Amino acid sequence: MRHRKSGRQLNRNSSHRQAMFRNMAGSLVRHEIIKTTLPKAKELRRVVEPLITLAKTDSVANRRLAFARTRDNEIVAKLFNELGPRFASRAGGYTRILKCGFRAGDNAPMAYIELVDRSE
Amino acid sequence: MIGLVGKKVGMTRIFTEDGVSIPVTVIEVEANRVTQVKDLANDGYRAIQVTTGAKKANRVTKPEAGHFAKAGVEAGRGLWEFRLAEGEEFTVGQSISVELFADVKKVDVTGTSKGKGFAGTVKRWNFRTQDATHGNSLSHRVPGSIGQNQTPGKVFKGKKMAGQMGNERVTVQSLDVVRVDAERNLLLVKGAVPGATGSDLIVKPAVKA
Amino acid sequence: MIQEQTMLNVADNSGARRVMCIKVLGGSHRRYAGVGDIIKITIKEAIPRGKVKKGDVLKAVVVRTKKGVRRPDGSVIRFDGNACVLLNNNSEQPIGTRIFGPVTRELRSEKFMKIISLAPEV
Amino acid sequence: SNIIKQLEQEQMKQDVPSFRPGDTVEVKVWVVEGSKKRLQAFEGVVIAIRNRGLHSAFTVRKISNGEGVERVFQTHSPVVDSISVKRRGAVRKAKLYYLRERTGKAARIKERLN
Amino acid sequence: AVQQNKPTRSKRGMRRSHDALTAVTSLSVDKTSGEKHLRHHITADGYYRGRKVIAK
RNA sequence: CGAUGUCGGCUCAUCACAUCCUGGGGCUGAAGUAGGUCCCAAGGGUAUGGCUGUUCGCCAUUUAAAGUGGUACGCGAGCUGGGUUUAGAACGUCGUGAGACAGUUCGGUCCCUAUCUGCCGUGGGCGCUGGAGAACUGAGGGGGGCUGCUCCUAGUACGAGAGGACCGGAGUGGACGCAUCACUGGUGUUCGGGUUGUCAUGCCAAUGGCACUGCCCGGUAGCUAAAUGCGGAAGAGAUAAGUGCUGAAAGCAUCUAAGCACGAAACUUGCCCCGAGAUGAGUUCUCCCUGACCCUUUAAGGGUCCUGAAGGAACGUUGAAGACGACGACGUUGAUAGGCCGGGUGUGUAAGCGCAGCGAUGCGUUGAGCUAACCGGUACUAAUGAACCGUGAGGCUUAACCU
RNA sequence: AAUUCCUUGUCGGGUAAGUUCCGACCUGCACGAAUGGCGUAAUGAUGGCCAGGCUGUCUCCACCCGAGACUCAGUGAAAU
RNA sequence: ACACAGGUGGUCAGGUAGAGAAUACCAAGGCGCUUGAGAGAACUCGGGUGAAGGAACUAGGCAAAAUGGUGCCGUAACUUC
RNA sequence: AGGACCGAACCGACUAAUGUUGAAAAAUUAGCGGAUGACUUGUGGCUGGGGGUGAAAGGCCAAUCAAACCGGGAGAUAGCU
Ligand SMILES: [Mg+2]
Ligand SMILES: [Mg+2]
Ligand SMILES: [Mg+2]
Ligand SMILES: [Mg+2]
Ligand SMILES: [Mg+2]
Ligand SMILES: [Mg+2]
Ligand SMILES: [Mg+2]
Ligand SMILES: [Mg+2]
Ligand SMILES: [Mg+2]
Ligand SMILES: [Mg+2]
Ligand SMILES: [Mg+2]
Ligand SMILES: [Mg+2]
Ligand SMILES: [Mg+2]
Ligand SMILES: [Mg+2]
Ligand SMILES: [Mg+2]
Ligand SMILES: [Mg+2]
Ligand SMILES: [Mg+2]
Ligand SMILES: [Mg+2]
Ligand SMILES: [Mg+2]
Ligand SMILES: [Mg+2]
Ligand SMILES: [Mg+2]
Ligand SMILES: [Mg+2]
Ligand SMILES: [Mg+2]
Ligand SMILES: [Mg+2]
Ligand SMILES: [Mg+2]
Ligand SMILES: [Mg+2]
Ligand SMILES: [Mg+2]
Ligand SMILES: [Mg+2]
Ligand SMILES: [Mg+2]
Ligand SMILES: [Mg+2]
Ligand SMILES: [Mg+2]
Ligand SMILES: [Mg+2]
Ligand SMILES: [Mg+2]
Ligand SMILES: [Mg+2]
Ligand SMILES: [Mg+2]
Ligand SMILES: [Mg+2]
Ligand SMILES: [Mg+2]
Ligand SMILES: [Mg+2]
Ligand SMILES: [Mg+2]
Ligand SMILES: [Mg+2]
Ligand SMILES: [Mg+2]
Ligand SMILES: [Mg+2]
Ligand SMILES: [Mg+2]
Ligand SMILES: [Mg+2]
Ligand SMILES: [Mg+2]
Ligand SMILES: [Mg+2]
Ligand SMILES: [Mg+2]
Ligand SMILES: [Mg+2]
Ligand SMILES: [Mg+2]
Ligand SMILES: [Mg+2]
Ligand SMILES: [Mg+2]
Ligand SMILES: [Mg+2]
Ligand SMILES: [Mg+2]
Ligand SMILES: [Mg+2]
Ligand SMILES: [Mg+2]
Ligand SMILES: [Mg+2]
Ligand SMILES: [Mg+2]
Ligand SMILES: [Mg+2]
Ligand SMILES: [Mg+2]
Ligand SMILES: [Mg+2]
Ligand SMILES: [Mg+2]
């Protein structure tokens, strides 16, 4: 029925979405912009925004939870140092979805997900 | 009398000092205002047109905005009708709150049920599932036979098959009203009313009982 | 939810140790039996010197269910183990003398005062 | 939900002692025969606490003279009169449903003593 | 699951009458560049709403 | 016979009335209760099991009753394959034999993506004639219609006694249907925790992956039944069988011929639902549009420039809506969704450190930390301004009031 | 009885209820002694039958996780 | 018949746990299988879990469920011992 | 010691489901039987159509068997369609 049920499935395993979103989150905390389809972009926003919110206060325990999920010292290094103090005053959404054309191979409605860090 | 238009706002329990719990549904009935009255002199029947709620200044369209302008009332989120009981004519612009149910003991509720999509035959019509073993290949929850043979030669008009379940207007009647929270603009009914928590309800006094 | 083929326990000194409900009495096509509903049982296990033996088709009345009984506030009372008290078909009186294993207050219906008088608790 | 939370807070009884699962509670309940309103006790171990506003309910288990008896208690119901805890337990679960198999000596738990 | 007679070339074309495509019927003209692009999509140049959001 | 798969079971049924029950009556060798029998009646309901391949039947225990048949002895392009008529084997019997037996026994691949009709749902186009946005009327269809027990009446009527009412009323259940998660529970591979093996993050300490979610214990939202509410009806109209009144034909008599009144779960409504494609295309309310030139077989004509409203659509954020369309809310004059903050709820005392002990580990910090869909707020991110479609007072004849 | 048509023979046991099953009575349609007769420890992806355990086989299904089905893009059949 | 879930003899065959070449997680090395992207209906297939009852299912406990390891204690009728 | 026992390789194929215009002109998934022998298997030979071989089913003899396949009698014959 799906009534009030959230979280997209993306035709994949629960063990696949766990690791796909783990790596796709790590690419955005390594390049700040990535191109992907909408149903992945609408979901990447759901796992990075709570990740940045977690990285808002530096701690020993927070950097464990930041490493438990996302399993990367480097992404954790870019957080708490770069992306931690950068979005300290912005309260809420730390990313932005920008739609674009379609994939020529399979007609997927692509979109640009990016951190709000274009202006330097 | 006629009935009011409210909005289903969840359900709770109301404890009696005897000790019996009462499953009570809270019905938010705001100030129902009357936009138009109808008489046999122009409409052939005797009924009123109510409205409740508050739309936005950009959403109430021009044909709608002129309709609320003739009464001189605010623009609600919908319009409904209520057939009059021969001696209860109201005026255009009159606001009925909840007080008509100050003496009513049993009400009937009317609202659109929850939508369930394209439901199966065992779910929509309570057909029994076949044996899911012993030999049953590829047919566990199917309907099985749907008609006889050459003599009828066709499926009869009105066969219970798979289709759209729910998302239709139903009327669960003879519900006892528990407490008329007049100053909070509520209505407490014993039981369960159709509709999701937020979909409107046409509550009206019991015609059957 | 006591129904046909349900293996019960005996809650009094009548002679049986384990009985099996063969048909839930009452209404036609009745599926499950409840709190103090009458059922027809058969005796599957017995003591040697009892008033009854294996294979007696006598009635009973449920007393303790593993499903429970819901008091009118929603407070269910959930026993652990199905049990019953044997009856005397034509006259419906309890054939057992001392009923052990606490009963529920829903039995107080003018036909089971003899059971709620001989019960230890509740 | 300001409508619901208003109707929910007005009927909950504001004197419930905060207990935990594992505590051996002693519950007094208003049992009536219709005419004679009488208070009786119910001594047992708190099996689960399902605390949710007015609809909060907890269950306790008494191993009676026959077998184990469990009953849930509508916490804010008028039939529940007193829920004075006797002693306090120390367990590492929110719900002790595993005791439904443990009988006798195997179904005893420790005490906090803090 | 097999046809008894054959359908006509009439019945075929009647069935495809719903399979006709729909045009977009409107192109949004951008503020800055003035290119014609889809609504809520970036330009082929890579601008959106007035800003170089593709950085290419 | 260039193919109609022969039994029974499962499932889903539908019709007939020669009716098993409930309902309305006559007669009774009908006191009462309970029955016998016939007439009217098909609205609804019309067993679970042991043995058998069985339908059937017998048996056990219930029920208000566990109806009789048609529909390829309904239903294999829906499912079983036990029986029966494939190839193997054996026993009894028959025959010299190969083999044979409405004799028997053990084992034996059951195919098909649905063009059309039909049926269950759901949209597009055009019509409805000036267009658009809403609320209804209602033709005509469908769903629903079952019923026990106990008490009061009264343990009165009736009856030697034992027993033991109709009618009327109230309450409580069984089966079935509708609706709903507040409770009682189930699921809950998106939340928490425990733990085995092993690999990895350089190691210890902590974590992640994989092994059916690794295996388990609990659990939010949603869904859901075993859970919780509700429903059948009352009443009205016209009738069946039947009961009658008055009453001639036939001085009487008679329910009928004129005339009139009673009379069932069947019929028509009353209850709920779909419903103006009801082409007989309805009614009411409101809103919007009242600009100029040419040709002309000069006609409800064709074309251009100037203007294109109300509204719709499109795209977008999505929804307790949903297969896809559609439907509902919102589109910054913003709460539609995500995030965030607080709360609730769930799991149970995180990490690190300190201390006690050789140690596993415990205690304190701390009922902490982590908390998914839930509740109330807040524009931080995304719903961009425009554009597209749709037009410019709405034919003829006739009549009624005005001019 | 892998044999008994009549037949679910009749009695007893198992069961609330047993056309199958187990033990017997002989009225053996139509058992019978190497086309072997009667028993037999063990063994059997053997036949029949019963009890315990155990469970969604079922009472009666409910939910969830994936692969198709559904929508869009590419390619593109078949019996008939 | 194909870039087909099939068939094809012999040899080498590590680490941890384990009785083992079982099985599980890894090394070396080799691959993600030549259609994908969304939605999250009925229904179908591969599976998970389940209140009370527990074969009431059915031709039949078919299929599932379940038991399951190493030591030690202990183990009947019958028997060719 | 054993045509011994449990159990992989290997061989075999009892049950169920899927499949049955399939991935396959008899396979796959989850369980099963044997698994030191009357075993299995690689390589090369030998037995041939009224014949071969057969722990015997009238099974097998190149996806064909109560008498293979190919060519030739032969345009057999057909009171049948
Ligand atoms: Mg949501
Ligand atoms: Mg796909
Ligand atoms: Mg069934
Ligand atoms: Mg088969
Ligand atoms: Mg098959
Ligand atoms: Mg199947
Ligand atoms: Mg098409
Ligand atoms: Mg033909
Ligand atoms: Mg046949
Ligand atoms: Mg009727
Ligand atoms: Mg049966
Ligand atoms: Mg029968
Ligand atoms: Mg049996
Ligand atoms: Mg043969
Ligand atoms: Mg349409
Ligand atoms: Mg009708
Ligand atoms: Mg009555
Ligand atoms: Mg729960
Ligand atoms: Mg779980
Ligand atoms: Mg290492
Ligand atoms: Mg370590
Ligand atoms: Mg783990
Ligand atoms: Mg009536
Ligand atoms: Mg009349
Ligand atoms: Mg008459
Ligand atoms: Mg009729
Ligand atoms: Mg309507
Ligand atoms: Mg406009
Ligand atoms: Mg839309
Ligand atoms: Mg605001
Ligand atoms: Mg929000
Ligand atoms: Mg809490
Ligand atoms: Mg601690
Ligand atoms: Mg941890
Ligand atoms: Mg929070
Ligand atoms: Mg016999
Ligand atoms: Mg016998
Ligand atoms: Mg012989
Ligand atoms: Mg001889
Ligand atoms: Mg022999
Ligand atoms: Mg013998
Ligand atoms: Mg053998
Ligand atoms: Mg058994
Ligand atoms: Mg396509
Ligand atoms: Mg390939
Ligand atoms: Mg291959
Ligand atoms: Mg090794
Ligand atoms: Mg080792
Ligand atoms: Mg291996
Ligand atoms: Mg590698
Ligand atoms: Mg699915
Ligand atoms: Mg399971
Ligand atoms: Mg059991
Ligand atoms: Mg098995
Ligand atoms: Mg298994
Ligand atoms: Mg072989
Ligand atoms: Mg295999
Ligand atoms: Mg094996
Ligand atoms: Mg060879
Ligand atoms: Mg020829
Ligand atoms: Mg010749």
From Swiss-Prot, chain A:
InterPro entries of this UniProt entry? Ribosomal_bL17, Ribosomal_bL17_CS, Ribosomal_bL17_sf
Q: Which Pfam families match?
A: Ribosomal_L17 (PF01196)
Asked if Ribonucleoprotein is a keyword of the record, the answer is yes
Please provide one cellular component term from the Gene Ontology annotations of this protein.
Answer: cytosolic large ribosomal subunit
Keywords attached to this Swiss-Prot or TrEMBL record, sorted alphabetically, are: Ribonucleoprotein, Ribosomal protein
Biological process GO annotation list?
Answer: translation
Q: MF terms per GO, please?
A: structural constituent of ribosome
Q: What is its quaternary makeup? A: Part of the 50S ribosomal subunit. Contacts protein L32.
Q: Which family does it belong to?
A: Belongs to the bacterial ribosomal protein bL17 family.
- The name under which this protein is listed is Large ribosomal subunit protein bL17
Q: Which organism is it from?
A: Escherichia coli O81 (strain ED1a)
